[PDB]
Design a protein around this nucleic acid. Structure first.
Ligand SMILES: [Ca+2]
Ligand SMILES: [Ca+2]
Length: 292
DNA sequence: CCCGCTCCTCATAATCCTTATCAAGCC
DNA sequence: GGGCTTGATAAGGATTATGAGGAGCGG
């Protein structure tokens, strides 16, 4: 039935709130303004996409040409049910600001303000701060907009474990890596890892995970991204594994968590020190994540 | 015609996810 | 003593996140 806090947590990772302003001769002012909300996932998560549709009970799930599909919402009534939800189950990443702007533009469209010259100017000023902002065409066409400020989003606190389970279902990773350790009996070793990746803008949120889960550490990526990594076994077995079983994943990634947990059990018996348990771990690794 | 809403498909690239190698150390 | 663990430390590449717009509908 999909938990609402799981929804906000998943949309916080995957999903986009957009305000499209494209030149269209069909409109009196020669400009088409439309609000849209789209989650774009790999086809393997087609089932999850349809579950999200059932959650909102609006929009449709479209099967793209590639190994990907989208849950899309592009109607007034539809967006109204989406805003009804996020006004009660808000996002907590920087995407929240993109949502509040998407909400401002939506209200103006409900007033037909996109059909007037002044209203269209307000909508262009808003789009100028949503996601990637204006392009080189809108800058040329709409010079002199009253530049509005991108809404500020207070520092985030994780307040519901189901939110984190959706945020993890969207941007988490369960790694079972076997590397070569010359100082070991078998010459190899097993490195388990839990990973939550995000951009520098939400570094506060990522460090929040350290206190919420009570473990892990923050890692900075030179390219401009921050990771939350739990890399010690004792915490993975006692904290992470129990957490994502009590607050389980719903997408395709849950399968990887299942195989991930199976490796945890073989490592709790010290089986990973033998060749039989190590071989079984490799058989498990070879069938999870990028090997399905 | 002109005007307005929205289904449905196609497009792009980087923020993600994923897979790595390593040695100081604990236990 | 010395296996075995674990944060530090890279980097790959595709699933994403963001997006454009034709054409079918009614007035
Ligand atoms: Ca994201
Ligand atoms: Ca994902």
């Amino acid at each position: 039935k999909l938990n609402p806090s799981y929804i906000s947590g998943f949309v916080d990772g995957e999903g986009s709130f957009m305000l499209t302003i494209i030149k269209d001769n069909k409109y009196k002012l020669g400009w088409r303004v439309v609000c849209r909300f789209v989650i774009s996932l790999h086809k393997k998560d087609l089932s999850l996409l349809n579950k999200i549709k059932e959650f909102f009970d609006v929009g449709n799930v479209f099967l793209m040409t590639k190994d990907s599909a989208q849950y899309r919402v592009e109607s007034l009534k539809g967006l109204d049910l989406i805003i009804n939800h996020f006004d009660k189950y808000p996002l907590i990443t920087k995407k929240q600001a993109d949502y509040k702007l998407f909400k401002m533009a939506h209200n103006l469209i409900k007033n037909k303000s996109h059909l007037t010259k002044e209203g269209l100017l307000e909508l262009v000023a808003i789009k100028a701060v949503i996601n990637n902002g204006l392009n080189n065409d809108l800058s040329i066409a709409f010079p002199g907009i009253n530049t509005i400020l991108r809404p500020d989003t207070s520092l985030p606190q994780i307040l519901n474990p189901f939110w984190l389970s959706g945020f993890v279902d969207a941007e988490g990773c369960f790694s079972v890596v076997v590397f070569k350790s010359k100082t070991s009996k078998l010459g190899e070793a097993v490195k388990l890892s839990f990973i939550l990746t995000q951009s520098n803008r939400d570094e506060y949120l990522i460090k929040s995970l350290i206190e919420y889960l009570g473990c892990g550490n923050t890692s900075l990526d030179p390219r401009g991204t921050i990771d939350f990594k739990v890399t010690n076994f004792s915490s993975i077995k006692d904290i992470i594994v129990p957490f994502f079983i009590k607050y389980p994943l719903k997408g395709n990634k849950n399968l990887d968590f299942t195989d991930f947990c199976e490796v945890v059990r073989l490592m709790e018996n010290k089986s990973h020190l033998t060749k039989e348990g190590l071989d079984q771990i490799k058989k498990i690794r070879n069938r999870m994540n990028t090997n399905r």
